Amino acid sequence: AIVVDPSSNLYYRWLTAIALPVFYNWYLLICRACFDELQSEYLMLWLVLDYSADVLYVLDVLVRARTGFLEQGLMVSDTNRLWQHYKTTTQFKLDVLSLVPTGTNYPEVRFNRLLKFSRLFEFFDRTETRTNYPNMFRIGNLVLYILIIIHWNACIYFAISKFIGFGTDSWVYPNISIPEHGRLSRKYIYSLYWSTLTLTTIGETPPPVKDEEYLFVVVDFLVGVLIFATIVGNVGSMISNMNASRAEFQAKIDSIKQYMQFRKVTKDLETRVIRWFDYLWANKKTVDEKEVLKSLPDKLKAEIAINVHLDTLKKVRIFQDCEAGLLVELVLKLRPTVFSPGDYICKKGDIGKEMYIINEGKLAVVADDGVTQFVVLSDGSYFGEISILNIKGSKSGNRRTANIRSIGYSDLFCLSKDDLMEALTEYPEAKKALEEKGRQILMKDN
Amino acid sequence: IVVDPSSNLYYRWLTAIALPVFYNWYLLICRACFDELQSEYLMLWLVLDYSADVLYVLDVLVRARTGFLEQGLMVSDTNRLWQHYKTTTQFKLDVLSLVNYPEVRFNRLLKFSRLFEFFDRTETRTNYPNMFRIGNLVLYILIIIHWNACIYFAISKFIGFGTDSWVYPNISIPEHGRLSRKYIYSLYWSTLTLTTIGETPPPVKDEEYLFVVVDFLVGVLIFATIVGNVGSMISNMNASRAEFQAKIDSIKQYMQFRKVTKDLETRVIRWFDYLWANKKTVDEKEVLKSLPDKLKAEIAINVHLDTLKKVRIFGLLVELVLKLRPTVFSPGDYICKKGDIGKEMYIINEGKLAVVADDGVTQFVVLSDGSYFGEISILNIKGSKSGNRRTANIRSIGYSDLFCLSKDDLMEALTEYPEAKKALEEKGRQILMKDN
Amino acid sequence: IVVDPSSNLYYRWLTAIALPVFYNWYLLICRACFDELQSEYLMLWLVLDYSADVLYVLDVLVRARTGFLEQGLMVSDTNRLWQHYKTTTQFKLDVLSLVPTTNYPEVRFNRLLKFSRLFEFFDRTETRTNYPNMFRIGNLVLYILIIIHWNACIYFAISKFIGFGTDSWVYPNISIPEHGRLSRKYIYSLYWSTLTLTTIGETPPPVKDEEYLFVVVDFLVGVLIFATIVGNVGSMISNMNASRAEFQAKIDSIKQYMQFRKVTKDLETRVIRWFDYLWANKKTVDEKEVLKSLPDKLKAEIAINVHLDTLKKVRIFQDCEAGLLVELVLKLRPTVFSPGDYICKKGDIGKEMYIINEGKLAVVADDGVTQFVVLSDGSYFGEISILNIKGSKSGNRRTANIRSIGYSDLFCLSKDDLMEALTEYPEAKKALEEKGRQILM
Amino acid sequence: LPNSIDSYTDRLYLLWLLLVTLAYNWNCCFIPLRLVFPYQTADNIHYWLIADIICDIIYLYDMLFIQPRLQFVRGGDIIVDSNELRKHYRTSTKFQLDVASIIPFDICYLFFGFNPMFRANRMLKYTSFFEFNHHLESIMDKAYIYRVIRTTGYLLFILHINACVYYWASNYEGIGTTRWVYDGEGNEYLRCYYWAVRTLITIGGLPEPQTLFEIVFQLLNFFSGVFVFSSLIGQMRDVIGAATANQNYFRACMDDTIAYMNNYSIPKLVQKRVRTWYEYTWDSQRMLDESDLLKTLPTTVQLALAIDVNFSIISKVDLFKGCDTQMIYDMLLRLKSVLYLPGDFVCKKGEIGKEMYIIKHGEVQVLGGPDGTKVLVTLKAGSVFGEISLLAAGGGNRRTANVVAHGFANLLTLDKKTLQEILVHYPDSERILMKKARVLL
Ligand SMILES: Nc1nc2c(ncn2[C@@H]2O[C@@H]3COP(=O)(O)O[C@H]3[C@H]2O)c(=O)[nH]1
Ligand SMILES: Nc1nc2c(ncn2[C@@H]2O[C@@H]3COP(=O)(O)O[C@H]3[C@H]2O)c(=O)[nH]1
Ligand SMILES: Nc1nc2c(ncn2[C@@H]2O[C@@H]3COP(=O)(O)O[C@H]3[C@H]2O)c(=O)[nH]1
Ligand SMILES: Nc1nc2c(ncn2[C@@H]2O[C@@H]3COP(=O)(O)O[C@H]3[C@H]2O)c(=O)[nH]1
Ligand SMILES: *[C@@H]1O[C@H](CO)[C@@H](O)[C@H](O)[C@H]1NC(C)=O
Ligand SMILES: *[C@@H]1O[C@H](CO)[C@@H](O)[C@H](O)[C@H]1NC(C)=O
Ligand SMILES: *[C@@H]1O[C@H](CO)[C@@H](O)[C@H](O)[C@H]1NC(C)=O
């Protein structure tokens, strides 16, 4: 008695292996019931597939008898508790009603075993959770739903045509003693043609002449309108939903464009902000990080922010001798932005409110005017500590000591002043190391 | 040479390579399914296919010598540019796309990426983005309708011309055997099928029934998607106007529910009529909240430095423009009454304001666009019988626009240089010495 | 004179000039295609075209005499008005729309160029009137009938160019007495036009190449234009229903939350009944965002106009120095309290005042409900958290247990809001003295 | 039958308003059917008349015996007394619509013949129908099922009205006269409902209109069918979108997080941990951010839900047994809930301490033995761990032992500066917490 868990991968493999016969039953039981040639021409194939479906249904009952459920956070493994919690509910009632045992020419007595629609929908929900292309999976799922609806209405039209009589009037399927319409391929593809032209509300089919045919075509048109237009609109919404993010970014661009065309901004600066939008779209840096993780807990958000920036944080002299909780809270507080080439990150004398850490950039410390590079700063270094942390032995306080220009497309980690002072409360050692680093670089520059 | 992808030369090459890709898609499916453009004029398609393969070989050359970005700098060595191009799926697709004779020449359709890059770069570059958007969606539905017309005529050629009722009729008839009627009837059939009107001659065979079912399902799903995108884009062409109208309707709903009087109703509707007829209906810091600080402060300097360089007293004015806040005032509006708590100064930007004493009348001086006020209350005159209060009365004459400047913002922007502090406080001492 | 472009005289002129533009578009595309209209009702079209011509001349005169804002002031210098009218493209559109040049409305087809008056009338009406969704439905249906009517006249002109009754697709032989009636011509062309542009297509199929190409182009224009206006009508219905739909989604979300957390049923129905009180008295919208979009003097004037009349009937009435009162009126926020919840508990930390407006609430005791007094409409309670001295009582806490009897609506004057409101004034000191008399009694 | 019905909490009033809806919908469905179809014949006219008398006495008895019992809120307080309720009803507009609905034309049938066009005043209890719709959507928990049933019923009602108007047009032109009209063969309602479906759905495929009245009818009916089909499929969609907008917002945030962590190439263990968090958050909360729903509510509503759930949880625990109630209630407002996967640490032996966890629906395991694998105690739900970090400046004893989450623990966090700014307003509760610290060490 080994208890499987519903958050594993073997339970998902079982959900695939049991959503195969449920989809086989829901696709082909009404077809074998409504087309009389599929039941009698193929006879060993549906016997083999029905034996496989009944064996997999009995094994589905024996798996759901031993499927654990979370009580007070942890999984349970008491087999009698799992069997009693299973035996309580309507899913066990639907499984036993789907597995009653109920010559060999009627699958209409086998209509009780399409009652595992909950298991098929559980497979589709677990695949939509597990997959990497969820919007394409949702499009495939709703296309499967409208194909199931078109196939079921095709079989229902052929059953109503069989009940009224083949070829007695104009609306029904024609006379099946004729060798043209007598074939199973012609039967099924013409029933799919009538089903598509009824449910898509095209209606180029022959009109009804009898009252039961009028009632079925009215009910079929209304079912097609409501259910088919709802799922076709959901297909259109889910195709436009992946274009909506790029359309949001483009609508932001067009708002800034109509601002600059209203206010008559000059052409080289307009070209430079167009190049910034082209860089920001061609390097795929559009999704905001702490906004897209705005609901995660701080432990998983810190694990994500460490496993993104790991090659950057392994080079920093702060994060080689500091503490792990300080590292976690600082990478929770690091908000990155991207600078242009040839721009001042910091002026000569300014109010310093943040600290910058380099992350895949290349910037240099220029003089008071013009581009005369003193020291180039590659990735992994940092600057801003003199204007953030107040040096007691300085010639100036809360004023910056240098001019820094960015040579290329740099990406810096903005770490604000109050965030650093609330991060450096119980971690004095790294604060003292930054203090002596700022003191020695200020004793270099007086 | 090394080209950079953000350049105007790269955009001109994206246009020059987006012409033969669109030509290749449209006219290669038309030629290879209609089979009479070839036998009519092989020579024009010969010279256009030669121009297309010349432009494809030059596109492999330009994508070989197209730079990229590591560490923010443009990589300039051509051997590493060739290596970084050669290790890619796009080089695989271009060398597969260089492997007349249009069924053999179906390899050329693989260069769709240059056309989609042209559409994205034109979308990011142009000044008519919604018109370009709906233009490329009209191109998408025309390409799908055209390709379905060619697929219908190919299936009609495969089954037989005029063997039954569904297919294109017998091309030995001199009326059904013209290329104009063959293409325009295939276009009419594909329009009737893809827009789900129906109204065609019905299929009478198994492959024709299957093709009409698959064509109606593709028409329903894909044309509902793309024609809904065109409808959403034409309804999204007026988005700021719809947001402004939603603000106007909710403010009018509040004023009709809360029994706001007819004078205030008429004045609020007059203010919104002014705000629409003077094109001030957008919000600058709401549309500029996503720009970085260099470009944001630089376009703010570019729109306000000509105003700030007409102030009577100032030489550096860079650090004041990015701390402004523009507000617009009505005619007959009191900015500050005679005796008030003063927290901000105001710099006039194309407005007319005056100073009054008898509640509206006897205007002493008027203050034009090249002036400012508020230099007294927030500036410490260390005496002169006044503290933390306003000793003046200002009425706004017309629809005046002006930037307010807070006390804390001016104190952080007035510590870098004491020359502006000394001049401003000397003018303040002279002003309230002349008044007091 | 100078016509003010924000006045109701200018809106009356926008109505009087948006009538002939509407007439010119509809009935010029109808008269240039259905020849029987221009042949039959000729005195009617001469009278209506003379009226539209003299109104176009008066529109050129009014646009020459229309002021504009320079430095916030309306320009009254008429020669500068005439030069400002000349320096734009609307003068060229008006001159090309006013060229005076009986079976030729092609010379009248340039009088369609004054469409800016029609679009400006629709924009000024959509700003001005109090029925905006009904006006947007009317404006959209007007655009639909422009498109359908124009396509009907294009279909009848293409049928006349091909030949009447020489085809299965065109309009039939007009020499027959049934098809030759002008009302049947126009109504069958409108039937063809709606049936083609809505993509229904119950028309006969084309047999010629130009009819095939025109039916293809008109099907594609019909599916794009009619998906556009179907999306516009659905967006107007959604914007008409959106406030109630957003509130009902809020109620469904909070009911799903309170039925998944298994809260008590009396607290659940108290919250749901309080939200239904908010919807039935229309106080569910906020004033903060909409008056934030409104400017400062207008939000102050509207706030005075609604709140000051209620502030007259409270004891906080002040005979002089009413700047404190207008600061209170700006500093209000209307909060609603359900019957049964306590506004202030006995002996708690205080940081906000309350001013009663359309409510009835009473102080109680600690043991049970024992109403000492009832603080009715126009009363105030709070003011122990204003840093009082230790006068008659030991310390400053909320010193009475007070509950709402009905659905009271209160204002909320906070701690620092009151310290910024009633500063530089002895009115805070006399309010301290009246609340000192309250803790004495 | 009580003296005053409470309209929000009365199941008998819901059943009676259902019985008024089953008379109003009888009127709206069987007034055009009897008006235009030959169904009100000489045989069953007494059957139709006793159904009319039953529906009319339901209308009259509803008004005169149920409607002045309706409680209503005047001035905040609930009005109970019957004379005030009768005055409020009789000076309202619902009484105006009901008294315009109950004007008898029973005098007029016997004079001017039996004709149900005289019953065109009984379709004015639409306010009672909408009151039934609002009350059933407030009683029902899953109201989107009744909303899709109501939208389907609106579609079937508009198709029923179009079937009656098509039978009017065919009886006006003569049955079997032209090819467009109803021929007269089968069921007179079903073969006209088929035409109403194929016209107002805009399918087409019917016989074409021949003369001008049929062309006008077919034109207006396809136009109204385009607009009614677009508007009702937009209503059915919006309803089916706002039903699962919560799950769609959750799945949009989950796909955005997964797309970001796939574009930045985070390993599969971290992707499995984020997917496990999203799976358990939708499994246990059905909502992404609980503070998103508990930040749009007012302070008293959030405090009432907080005192219910979290004061149950904290009256369970013994560490808060003598503290002050407003301090505890501000802590209950300030409590932040995070979720921990099975296995991760919530405190490590060596890191600093700034959180006080109150475990609710979880199971954590402290680990402080010889090597960190011996469990000293396994804390169940409703306990408190993380309280050592009050004294010794946070660094005399930073964190005592390892403690992992054994199951899916859902802890209630409390930031330390928020705990200190809460506790500086209560020095006696600070003395109780220092007493807890002295009994701890
Ligand atoms: N003063 C100074 N700063 C330098 C030098 N080289 C790099 N930097 C960084 O440049 C800085 C500019 O801003 P900060 O004052 O914040 O701090 C300074 C240092 O971190 C140097 O030689 N002098
Ligand atoms: N008192 C005063 N203020 C003036 C005069 N001319 C311009 N101003 C400006 O008007 C002002 C109104 O507001 P402030 O008190 O803030 O400061 C005052 C001055 O900046 C003048 O003659 N007297
Ligand atoms: N203490 C007290 N407050 C009263 C009385 N009548 C009305 N009130 C108001 O009830 C209050 C409850 O809150 P506050 O302490 O803020 O201030 C108190 C008074 O404003 C009374 O008799 N005693
Ligand atoms: N060390 C320890 N902590 C315990 C025990 N039982 C409950 N706790 C709490 O578990 C804690 C985990 O975090 P703390 O170090 O902050 O403080 C510790 C105690 O408050 C126990 O047996 N040992
Ligand atoms: C079908 O066709 C056969 C002969 O082809 C004929 O005898 C039979 O009656 C037909 N069926 C019907 C229902 O008419
Ligand atoms: C097409 O027409 C020619 C001559 O008109 C005839 O010989 C041929 O058989 C026709 N083809 C078909 C498929 O009918
Ligand atoms: C139209 O009818 C007239 C007779 O009324 C006939 O002479 C003419 O040929 C007809 N034209 C067409 C195109 O049918």
The 3-state secondary structure of B384-421, one letter per residue: CCCCCECCCCEEECCCEEEEEEEHHHHHHCCCCCHHHH
- Sort strands A335-338 and A411-416 into parallel, antiparallel or unpaired: antiparallel
Angle between helices C209-260 and C265-280 (to 10 degrees): 130
Question: D155 and D77, same structural domain?
Answer: no
Q: Is D3 helix (H, G, I), strand (E, B) or coil?
A: coil
Q: How many CB atoms lie within 10 A of CB D330?
A: 20
Strands (E), B275-397: 325-329, 333-334, 344-348, 353-355, 366-367, 372-373, 394-396
Tell me the CB-side half-sphere exposure of residue C194, using CA atoms within 13 A: 22
* Sign of the CA dihedral with A241 first, then A242, A245, and A247 last: negative
Q: DSSP 3-state assignment of B174?
A: coil
Considering only the C-alpha atoms of chain A, give the largest distance between any 2 of them, rounded to a whole number of Å.
107
Ligand 1 pocket, residue A445 CB under 6 Å: yes
Nearest 5°: the CA angle A301, A307, A308 is 90
Amino acid in the structure at residue D316: K
Q: How many helices (H) and strands (E) does chain B have?
A: 16, 10
Alpha helices in C129-208 (DSSP H): 132-162, 182-197
Whether residue C290 and residue B235 make contact (CB cut-off 8 A), yes or no, is no
A295: left (phi over 0), alpha (psi -120 to 50) or beta: alpha
Rounded Cα distance, A140 and B391, in Å: 73
B172 lines ligand 6 (CB under 6 A): yes
The Cα–Cα gap between B310 and C318 comes to 45
Instruction: Identify the CA nearest to B216 among candidates B196, B192, B190, B191.
Output: B196
* Measured distance CA(C335)–CA(C352) in Å, rounded: 12
**Domain end residue (candidates: D139, D156, D172):** D139
Question: What strand order describes the sheet that includes D357-359?
Answer: D336-340, D409-413, D357-359, D383-385
Whether residue D40 contacts residue D30, with contact meaning beta carbons closer than 8 Å, is answered with: no
Q: Rounded to whole angstroms, how far apart are CA atoms A194 and A204?
A: 9
CB pairs under 8 A between A and B: 144
DSSP code, position C352:
B
Q: How far apart are CA A217 and CA D186, in angstroms?
A: 15
C290 and B259 within 8 Å at the Cβ level: the answer is: no
**Min Cα separation C58/chain D (Å):** 38
Provide φ and ψ at A327, rounded to 5°.
Answer: -65, -40
Measured CA to CA, the distance from residue D377 to residue D114 in angstroms comes to 87
Three-class secondary structure assignment of B181-194: HHHHHHHHHHHHHH
Contact at 8 Å (CB) between D388 and D366? no
Please, what is the Cα angle at A253 between A248 and A256, to 5 degrees?
125
CB A367 within 8 A of CB A403: yes
Gaps in chain A (C to N over 2.5 angstroms) fall after 102
**Alpha-carbon distance D228 to C62, whole Å?**
43
Q: Which amino acid is at B39?
A: S
* CATH code of D309's domain: 2.60.120.10
Count of beta carbons in the 10 Å neighbourhood of residue C259: 12
Mutation pick for ligand 2 pocket among B336, B431, B435, B436 (CB with most ligand atoms within 8 Å): B431
Query: Which among D123, D135, D139 is positioned nearest to D70, based on CA atoms?
Result: D135
Q: Of D104, D123, D139, which residue constitutes the final position of a domain?
A: D139
Q: Please list the residues that pair with A290 across neighbouring strands.
A: none
Binding site membership of A167 for ligand 5 (Cβ less than 6 Å): yes
Q: Report the number of secondary-structure helices (H) and strands (E) in chain D.
A: 16, 10
Of the candidates A165, A124, A111, the residue with the CA atom closest to the CA atom of residue A18: A124
Same domain, D433 and D388: yes
Residue B46, SS3 per DSSP:
helix
Is the Cα torsion angle A372, A375, A377, A378 positive or negative in sign?
Answer: positive
Strand order in the sheet with D402-405: D345-347, D402-405, D364-367, D375-379
Residues 6+ apart with CB under 8 A from C172: C164, C165, C179
Are D226 and D258 contained in the same domain? no
A350 CB-near residues (< 8 Å, 6+ apart): A387, A399, A400
Burial, D340: exposed, middle or buried (Cβ in 10 Å; 0-12, 13-18, 19+)?
Answer: buried
DSSP state of D170: H
Residues D421, D305 within the same domain? yes
* Assigned token pair, D434: 């220092």
Number of alpha carbons in the 13 Å side-chain half-sphere of residue C429: 3
What range does the domain containing D218 cover?
141-243
- Amino acid letter at B138? V
Cα dihedral D347, D348, D349, D350 sign: negative
**CA–CA separation, A318 and C46 (whole Å):** 89
Q: Are residues D311 and D434 in the same domain?
A: yes
Judge if D1 and D129 occupy the same domain.
yes
User: CB-side exposure of A415: number of CA atoms within 13 Å?
Assistant: 25
Q: Which residues of B are annotated as a binding site?
A: 374-375, 377, 390-391, 435
Buried b / exposed e over B217-233, threshold 16 CB at 10 Å, is bebbbbbbbbbbbbbbb
In a mutagenesis test of the D interface, which of A5, A7, A8, A72 is the best target, namely the one with the most D β-carbons within 10 Å?
Answer: A72
Name the 3-class secondary structure at B277. helix
Q: Which residues contact C24 (CB under 8 A, 6 or more apart)?
A: C52, C108, C111, C112, C114
Best of C194, C279, C284, C337 to disrupt the D interface by mutation (most D CBs within 10 Å)?
C194
**In this structure, which long-range contacts are made by residues C173-177, counting pairs with CB atoms below 8 Å and at least 24 apart in sequence?**
none
| DSSP for residue A223 | H
β-pair partners for C375: C361
Q: Does B235 touch chain A (CB under 8 A)?
A: no
Q: What SS3 class is residue D206? A: coil
Cβ atoms of B311 and B375 closer than 8 Å: no
Helix (H) or strand (E) holding A382: strand A382-383
Encode burial over D190-209: b for 16+ CB neighbours within 10 A, e otherwise: bbbbbbbbbbbbbbbbbeeb
Rounded to whole angstroms, how far apart are CA atoms A291 and D111?
75
Chain CA centroid to CA B385, Å: 56
| Cα C166 to ligand 7 centroid, rounded to whole Å | 9
Per DSSP, helices labelled H in A98-210 are: 117-130, 134-164, 184-199
Subunits touching D (CB < 8 Å, at least 3 pairs)?
A: A, C
What's D200's domain CATH number?
1.10.287
Could you tell me the two tokens for C26? Answer: 């509809």
Say which residue the tokens 């010598």 belong to.
Answer: B65
Residues 6+ apart with CB under 8 A from B385: B436
- Quick check: A410 and B212 CB within 8 A? no
Q: Tokens 């905001």, residue?
A: A288
CA distance B267 to D112: 57
Alpha-carbon distance values, D356 to A8, A182, D362, D440 (Å):
33, 78, 15, 15
Return the H-helix or E-strand segment holding B241.
helix B240-257
Residues 6+ apart with CB under 8 A from A152: A30
Residue C255 CA to residue D137 CA, distance in Å, equals: 12
Whole-number Cα distances in Å, D223 to C196, C198, D220, D226, D229: 12, 8, 5, 5, 10
**Can you tell me which atom of ligand 6 is nearest the CA of B162?**
13
Answer yes or no: are the C-beta atoms of A161 and A36 closer than 8 Å. Answer: no
Give the closest residue to A74 by CA, choosing from B73, D405, C332: D405
Structure tokens at B236: 């999204």
What is the separation of C-alpha D438 from the centre of its chain, rounded to a whole number of angstroms?
51
Both D161 and D281 in one domain: the answer is no
DSSP H helices in A5-133? 10-34, 36-40, 44-64, 79-88, 90-97, 117-130
Contacts by B3-8 with C-beta closer than 8 Å and gap 24+?
Answer: B3/B62, B3/B65, B3/B66, B3/B67, B4/B66, B4/B67, B4/B74, B5/A278, B5/A282, B5/B66, B5/B67, B5/B68, B6/A275, B6/A278, B6/A279, B6/A282
Neighbours of C225 (CB within 10 A): 20
Instruction: State the DSSP string of D239-308.
Output: HHHHHSHHHHHHHHHHHHHHHHHHHTT--HHHHHHHHHHHHHHHHHTSSS-HHHHSSSS-HHHHHHHHHH
What is the residue whose two structure tokens read 């209000």?
A: C332
How crowded is residue B261: how many other Cβ atoms within 10 Å of its Cβ? 13
How far CA A129 is from CA of A9, A70, A141, A146, A163, in Å, comes to 12, 19, 13, 22, 44
CB within 8 A of B311, min separation 6: which ones?
A: B317, B347, B370, B371, B372
Q: Are D204 and C191 in contact (CB under 8 A)?
A: no
Of C270, C258, C433, C252, give the one whose Cα is nearest residue C341. C270
Amino acid present at A242:
M
Beta bridge partners of B404: B325, B346
- Regarding whether D150 and D198 lie in a shared domain, the answer is yes
Contact yes or no for A313/A306 (Cβ under 8 A): yes
Nearest to B336 by CA among B271, B402, B433: B402
Structure tokens at A443: 């004793």
Angle at CA C26, nearest 5°, toward B228 and C128? 70
CB atoms within 10 A of CB A422: 12
Q: CA distances (Å), B215 to each of A194, B208, B226, B294, in order?
A: 14, 10, 15, 53
In a shared domain, residues D275 and D406? no
- Rounded to whole angstroms, how far apart are CA atoms D355 and D387? 8
Domain end point (choices D94, D113, D139): D139
Q: D41 and D149 share a domain? A: no
Q: Which residues of C touch D219 (CB under 8 A)?
A: 187, 190-191, 194
Helices and strands in chain A: count of H runs, count of E runs: 18, 10
Total domains present in chain D: 4
* DSSP-assigned letters across all residues of C354-403: EEBSS--EEEE-SSS---S-EE-TT-EE--STTT--SSSSSS-S--SEEE
A347 Cα: distance to centroid of ligand 1 (angstroms) = 11
D348 and D299 inside one domain = yes
DSSP letter assigned to residue A226: I
Angle at D165 between CA D163 and CA D166, to 5 degrees: 65
- For residue C5, count CB atoms less than 10 angstroms from its CB and return exposed for 0-12, middle for 13-18, buried for 19 or more: buried
Residue B132 bridge partners (DSSP) = none
- Indicate whether D189 and D273 sit together in one domain: no
Burial of residue A405, with CB atoms counted within 10 A of its CB: 0-12 exposed, 13-18 middle, 19 or more buried: buried
Phi-psi region of C249 (alpha: psi -120 to 50; beta: other; left: phi over 0): alpha
The length of chain D in residues reads: 441
**B374-B375-B381 Cα angle (round to 5):** 130
Cα of A350 vs centre of ligand 1, distance in Å, is 13
**Cβ of residue A177 lying under 6 Å from some atom of ligand 5:** yes
Q: Which atom of ligand 4 is nearest to the CA of D387?
A: 20
**Method used for this model?**
cryo-EM
Backbone angles phi, psi at B102, to 5 degrees: -80, -25
